[PDB]
Design a protein around this ligand. Structure first.
Ligand SMILES: [Zn+2]
Ligand SMILES: [Zn+2]
Ligand SMILES: [Zn+2]
Ligand SMILES: [Zn+2]
Lengths: 198, 198, 198, 198
DNA sequence: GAACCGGTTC
DNA sequence: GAACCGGTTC
DNA sequence: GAACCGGTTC
DNA sequence: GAACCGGTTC
């Protein structure tokens, strides 16, 4: 509970998370690599994800997004927004999301922003909502409010964003995860990591 | 309910929406592309649509027109009229439609203009009326009160206009949708998008 | 007093207005062509001018900037900021100067933005200051708050910016003028008009 | 008094500012190019300057350093430390000098950091001291507390550091100036700009 | 110090 | 989108 | 900065 | 309807 675990766990109610097709254009505001499981996004731009289920009934259950550093040494640094932005003008005046928080949800007002008093981890939870009438989809709109590259926060040390499905008491029914990179050029970053790997 | 769903849904009372033939002339005030499902219209000019039914009886039921941005990032921006028009002279003095609204209905005085107090979405609903004695047709006259290209509103980010058929309690019995583009030259825009695609 | 005169007028003090050399790079934030006597600048960016005089004072003199339309038919529309600029966030909240004004002054706190209660012309007046010791001219930082290209205000009808040096009682002691253009690309625009006269 | 003059001004005492030879090694903590009159230094490292005068006093004279932006459009933003520097641990706790200030003085306890309550310009003043016996110049140790490269404060718009020698009542007796650049690599940066003029 | 990256401008 | 810049890696 | 689009004039 | 213009995209 004190240290987040970072392993894929479908659990008994299969938990699956996918992405509608993202542009293969260099100008896309966000894009996901199925080869690497890496999300490339831009600051403050909605990158939506779809969580999908086939056996959706538990009660009052929610989904958490919790950012974590992959590399061992900072893993004990609470991930947060690096000092100029948490405190800049451009995205501080608008929401009730804590200025200190890295991850926001944009289309949901039943969002609960958690800053753990004991562990200090900050994450964002939404109540589970079945899809809108008739199909796999259920969209959550995330907003990333800083770069991976930023001074004071991640400082160019890549982070995995872990999404967990949880019962009201916190017990995990499903969880999946992938690493996220928040640069000013996700289409170019997508192509490059992939180039070096092949 | 907070985020509009944008998928075609005929529903149990088949819901179908069509267009009488529009000019293939470059001077047409409006025109629809069956290939792309894209409506090209001009500011403030009546572009009528026909909704048709074969099994028309529910009670007090209505049809909604609700504009939505297609692209993910603004989808959380309430679609509205960009600051010079909501506030210009030319179409503000005339109707009780809210100056802030993008979509109006012209031949109907039982129009109810909804500005959601909770979600903030603005849409226009009319009570369902059977056709005038004897044929498929039932016309609704829409007026688009700003360009897609306009500064402050859509700002050149294309929007889909979703028409839903709803019972008095709001439950959807039919819905269909298509993307709309509101330029100063719909005949030319029709020909061009279509050129690039083929 | 009701319709402004639009002619250059050297004073007893030989009022002259000049501009420092501006980068001729297209990336310049503003550039004047001495040839056509017209200023090209960018929205909201500081655009300083040079006044030079042969003698000083007399006590209490001021300098006014008042924009006026060159075409005969618009001259009776008071020239003001367009409704989209007038009502936005970017520069209305941070300023104490009235929002309807096209012309602002930067770094000067005794600026008086005159909105004639009677004629309605808007201008900005500062008290005359002799130059800083040993310099030839006192710089004034203007800010132009709408583009020539703008909808609702100036609307693509070119403007002359009239600069008058006047005693407290209003009599004109010096006068000069130039036509002003406020686009989003001043190096290119300057270059294109210059290409066009020949 | 409201907008600073940005011109070199020898006083009655022939105020001159020079710099000792700096290692030309790229490992130098700071290096000035006499050719371009611009200083290259490193964050938080002592960067001393030489003043020379032809005559002393008169009683009670002081020396001010005030940074000001070279580009016209930023000149009205008060130049200060960027929020990341302003609020950190490395140099805020150990110093009694105000954190918002770009310029600090080392080893001098009667330094007065002036934050104009009225104009808001920040500068640092020390009383003039004649040189130590038999030396030509009195050294002042400045510390620059944000990089030119910094986010939120200076943000990659070059700065002139204005050094003025002034009587207690504020009148300027001498003046000199240079453009300042505070990067993480001064020998290389100096060398690159110098390569570039020719 | 030379080589690298990743945000910024043209 | 390409070329440039400037702190960081090693 | 060059190339693109989409509203405006001739 | 064709040619021009001028902020925006990339
Ligand atoms: Zn940041
Ligand atoms: Zn509009
Ligand atoms: Zn305007
Ligand atoms: Zn800083």
């Amino acid at each position: 509970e004190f240290i987040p675990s970072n392993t894929d766990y479908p659990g008994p109610h299969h938990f699956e998370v996918t992405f509608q097709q993202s542009s293969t254009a260099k100008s896309a505001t966000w894009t996901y690599s199925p080869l690497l499981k890496k999300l490339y996004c831009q600051i403050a731009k909605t990158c939506p994800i779809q969580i999908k289920v086939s056996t959706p009934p538990p009660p009052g259950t929610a989904i958490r997004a919790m950012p974590v550093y992959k590399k061992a040494e900072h893993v004990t640094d609470v991930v947060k927004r690096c000092p100029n932005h948490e405190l800049g003008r451009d995205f501080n005046e608008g929401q009730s999301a804590p200025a200190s928080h890295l991850i926001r949800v944009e289309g949901n007002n039943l969002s609960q922003y958690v800053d753990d008093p004991v562990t200090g981890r900050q994450s964002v939870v939404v109540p589970y909502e079945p899809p809108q009438v008739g199909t796999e989809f259920t969209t959550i709109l995330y907003n990333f409010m800083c770069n991976s590259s930023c001074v004071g926060g991640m400082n160019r040390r890549p982070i995995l964003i872990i999404i967990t499905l949880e019962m009201r008491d916190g017990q995990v029914l499903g969880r999946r995860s992938f690493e996220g990179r928040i640069c000013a050029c996700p289409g170019r970053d997508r192509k490059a990591d992939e180039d070096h790997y092949r």
